[PDB]
Design a binder for this molecule. Structure first.
Ligand code: HEM
Ligand code: HEM
Ligand code: HEM
Ligand code: HEM
Lengths: 146, 141, 141, 146
């Protein structure tokens, strides 16, 4: 990344405080609610007819945990997100047909969730560093599209 | 908002398209598939090969809708309601992709109507495509 | 288009902001300057340093205008005519920028209104900032 | 910059046929006309009130030629655009205060200009090479923003 040692440390330290279970479920559900068109990829999850139905949907919650998990592991390879997400980039392209823009929407949803959770702790400088990571991750994942 | 001027511009340049709208529709698609490969994620079911009949068939449908929008330049929201509903509810194309297509349509027209593709007309067609895209995306959330 | 549920959600959320809107305007700007440094190109004449009174002042101004918009949620176009004017013909900020400030505004609200920043309120506020953005850039061309 | 050898040859073969004086003038004029907000950077250029006032403005023509000149040079260093464009990047940021989005609008306008001029010669695949190119240049020009 073009992360400053200071920026790296900020990312790393807040992350340490994250419950991926809860944050993953919420980020993905919020995505499905704020930007309803992203639901086109989760037809099989069920009833996403309402905020409550999305937020309550266990398939959504569990998919959320899987997504943040992989995200979480990528924070360990911040100096090579490209290589960390290569196989995932091909998958998303070749099997899933997910438009990379959704990677971007999620990213911003993630930052909103983090702010939501951490209040005060989630400062301008901390958000700045997180914005670089989400951007970085999205690029990494979209990297193998052809 | 489209001005009388804009309207005249669009009707005139689209006027020139005539019977090539279909072919120009197919070409704008190919241009888009080639320059912005992420747009391809919406046509997994398509043969995106050069001269694909699916692409031909699709380019005509798109051109027909634009032609329909020009015909109803004073009532686009209503002339396109159905297509607006389809995109919002079934297709669910991310909004960003409209701009990509619009762009490739402009390139296509530019490539075919050199005499008409003036700065003024260019500007008018760009505002037009933007308007169409807004209508098609209006019922998204 | 803002639904009645949306309008309610927004008035609620903003209701909670209260005497802090000025502070939240300022905070949103600060987050914007730091996260999207290209936005600074529009404020060469400002002291963009932390706690700058220019930034604080501008923060108030923006907040106030948002307030006025929530209040005229039913007639935004009219309530923000002047502002749409200023932006289209004087300021000439690129439309892409509106989306960055909107985002920094959500983040700020979320970080400050924990209980109130539900998934449904989040969606509404976003739509709202989007509508405000559309209004402010409607006379650009 | 994922320019395949064949994409690179294509950029270059076409660029051979371009009259940078002319194209520069057209691309810049056209930008001020399609996205009038971009006129914010040229208030000393005089009359830009109409398409003819812009397209014909001697100052716009001269500036366009300058801009495309710089771009042309960039085309000879497709390998090192960031390096090629670094002092310019800094100037645009620090002195001119030019929002980088303007670099992307100009790229698209330029692509329409090349389509307009070459007609059928500007094939789908040639467009895709140029799309990569204008993007790389815009990115190079924004690399030094802070
Ligand atoms: C932070 C960015 C993301 C990461 C790290 C990520 C990661 C993953 C992982 C690890 C899987 C597991 C599938 C497997 O290994 O077979 C997966 C599946 C999937 N992802 Fe992504 N994802 C991301 C963003 C998204 C977004 C934004 C969407 C759509 C809105 C999406 C749609 C899907 C779908 C539809 C599947 C398949 C799940 C199934 O089989 O039901 N992903 N993703
Ligand atoms: C101004 C721009 C657009 C116009 C006028 C337009 C119009 C149409 C029309 C007329 C159809 C056929 C509906 C039918 O079956 O009767 C269609 C279908 C479709 N469009 Fe759009 N559209 C536009 C933008 C887009 C974009 C940007 C994308 C994605 C990159 C897209 C993706 C699709 C898809 C996936 C279908 C279904 C095709 C099929 O399965 O046969 N559209 N569109
Ligand atoms: C949410 C949308 C926005 C709202 C409601 C808003 C509101 C305002 C207000 C109320 C003013 C002050 C008018 C006066 O001085 O009487 C203003 C000025 C200004 N705005 Fe906008 N603004 C918005 C978005 C933006 C964005 C995104 C930018 C740039 C990135 C921007 C750039 C400016 C600048 C440079 C000024 C003048 C600053 C000065 O010299 O004091 N605005 N805006
Ligand atoms: C391909 C992208 C571009 C290139 C290669 C480029 C190149 C140049 C060069 C070589 C100069 C003269 C430097 C000097 O004065 O020392 C210049 C100046 C300038 N450029 Fe850029 N430019 C580009 C895009 C833009 C765009 C899109 C805008 C605004 C919309 C812009 C705004 C300016 C301005 C305002 C000046 C100074 C003009 C004056 O002398 O008053 N440039 N540019």
């Amino acid at each position: 990344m073009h992360l400053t040692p200071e920026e790296k440390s900020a990312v790393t330290a807040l992350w340490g405080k994250v419950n991926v279970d809860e944050v993953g479920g919420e980020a993905l559900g919020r995505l499905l609610v704020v930007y309803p068109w992203t639901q086109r990829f989760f037809e099989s999850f069920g009833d996403l007819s309402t905020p409550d139905a999305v937020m309550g949907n266990p398939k959504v919650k569990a998919h959320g945990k899987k997504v943040l998990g992989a995200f979480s592991d990528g924070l360990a390879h911040l100096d090579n997100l490209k290589g960390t997400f290569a196989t995932l980039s091909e998958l998303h392209c070749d099997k899933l047909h997910v438009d990379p823009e959704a990677f971007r929407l999620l990213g911003n949803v993630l930052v909103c969730v983090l702010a939501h959770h951490f209040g005060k702790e989630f400062t301008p400088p901390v958000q700045a560093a997180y914005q670089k990571v989400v951007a970085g991750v999205a690029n990494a994942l979209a990297h193998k599209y052809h | 908002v489209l001005s009388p001027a804009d309207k005249t511009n669009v009707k005139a340049a689209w006027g020139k398209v005539g019977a090539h709208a279909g072919e120009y529709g197919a070409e704008a698609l190919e241009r888009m598939f080639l320059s912005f490969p992420t747009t391809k994620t919406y046509f997994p079911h398509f043969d995106l090969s050069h001269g694909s009949a699916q692409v031909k068939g699709h380019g005509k449908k798109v051109a027909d809708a634009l032609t329909n929008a020009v015909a109803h330049v004073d009532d686009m929201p209503n002339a396109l309601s159905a297509l607006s509903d389809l995109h919002a509810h079934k297709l669910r194309v991310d909004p960003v992709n409209f701009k990509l297509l619009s762009h490739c349509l402009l390139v296509t027209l530019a490539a075919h109507l050199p005499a008409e593709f003036t700065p003024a007309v260019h500007a008018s067609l760009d505002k037009f495509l933007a308007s169409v895209s807004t209508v098609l995306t209006s019922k998204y959330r």
